[PDB]
């Protein structure tokens, strides 16, 4: 991926009854599905469509159908979206007509308002022991490992159809990269490069599974991208003892590129047959894609690394690397709709 589009202005999908409720209805926006308030949209009405996680600051002429659920977060009041069950109809995100918003009367479908609109994504404190000294920024020449949502990517779901997908069990935690190029070697969290010291989470996962001498013995600029998990980090949802780190992506520094599925599990092979213990997050059966959005969201639940709990959902990473998305459970988001 790259930059949450929050805000983004979407059409108005089918839009469909909710029995036992005669005051709203459903709209599908995308792969996203909302109650919408009875006469506000007709299908293919454009609306401003706020996802989950928007933190919206306070505003009862734009926005007073937000002021029952006005928090602080960061010293602001406002309200957080987050998934939502109206009538036995799930609900996520907020859509808003057009005419709420004349200043935006000239943007396109597809346009990020998320900066016009003063928006910012709400997110939990950070673990203590995942925060660190910092050698510096995170490497300009190692992508991050963010994924863009299945629920918005409506015409790339059938671009791909027939193509063949890794299929990897999303794990709770947070990121980490451990990666080689030349003479050094760095380790750094989701944000940041980080020094070594006695404390620091993700450096001791690295030299307890041996990925730096790892790192060395392979002698190629590659960057280790994985999920540390485990006690203290978001709630330990996998019931695991102890931190420990695995991996889901190995980014190619001098081609600029991901190593494709089976290259990665090759490496991951040989650092093991070598004695280098790096675990690889969870594996299913590959997927050859010819799928609606609401089909793969329905492969999303299901059990974890752990298969007496829930996971979180799953990634889909296409065999030659190059196409990548996530399908997070809205099952998981229900149950967890409190943390
Ligand atoms: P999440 O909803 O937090 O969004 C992407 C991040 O998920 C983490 N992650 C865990 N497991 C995986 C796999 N198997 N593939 C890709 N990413 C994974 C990363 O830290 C992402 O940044």
Redesign the pocket.
């Known amino acids: 991926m790259g930059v949450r589009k929050l805000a983004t202005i979407r059409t108005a999908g089918e839009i469909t009854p909710i029995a036992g409720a005669e005051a709203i209805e459903c709209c599908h926006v995308d792969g996203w599905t909302c109650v919408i308030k009875k006469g506000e949209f007709k299908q293919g009405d454009r609306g401003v469509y706020f996802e989950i996680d928007s933190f919206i600051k306070e505003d009862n002429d734009r926005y007073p159908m937000l002021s029952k659920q006005v928090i602080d977060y960061e010293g602001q009041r406002g309200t957080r979206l987050r998934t939502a069950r109206l009538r036995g109809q799930l609900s996520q995100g907020l859509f808003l007509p057009m005419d709420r918003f004349p200043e935006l009367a000239s943007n396109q479908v597809g346009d990020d308002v998320t900066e016009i609109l003063g928006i910012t994504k709400w997110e939990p404190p950070i673990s203590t022991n995942l925060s660190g000294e910092i050698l510096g920024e995170f490497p300009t020449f190692i992508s991050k490992?963010?994924?863009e949502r299945v629920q918005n990517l409506i015409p790339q779901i059938e671009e791909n159809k027939g193509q063949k997908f890794e299929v990897?069990?999303?794990?709770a935690?947070?990121?980490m990269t451990v990666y080689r190029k030349d003479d050094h070697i760095g380790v750094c969290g989701?944000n940041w490069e980080l020094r070594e010291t006695a404390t620091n989470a993700q450096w001791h996962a690295a030299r307890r599974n041996k990925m730096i001498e790892g790192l060395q013995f392979l002698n190629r600029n590659l960057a280790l991208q994985g999920?540390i998990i485990g006690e203290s980090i978001q709630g330990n949802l996998e019931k695991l003892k102890g931190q420990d780190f695995y991996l889901?992506?190995i980014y190619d520094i001098d081609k600029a590129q991901y190593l494709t599925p089976i290259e990665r599990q090759s490496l991951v092979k040989q650092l093991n047959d070598n004695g280098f213990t790096v675990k690889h997050?969870p594996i299913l059966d590959d997927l050859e894609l010819n799928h609606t959005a609401e089909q793969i969201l329905a492969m999303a639940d299901g059990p974890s690394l752990n298969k007496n709990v829930k996971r979180?959902?799953l990634?889909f990473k296409r065999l030659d690397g190059k196409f990548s998305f996530?399908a997070?459970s809205n099952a998981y988001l229900e149950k967890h709709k409190d943390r």
């Open positions: 490992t963010d994924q990897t069990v999303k794990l935690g947070s990121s989701r999920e889901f992506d997050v979180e959902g990634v996530k997070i």
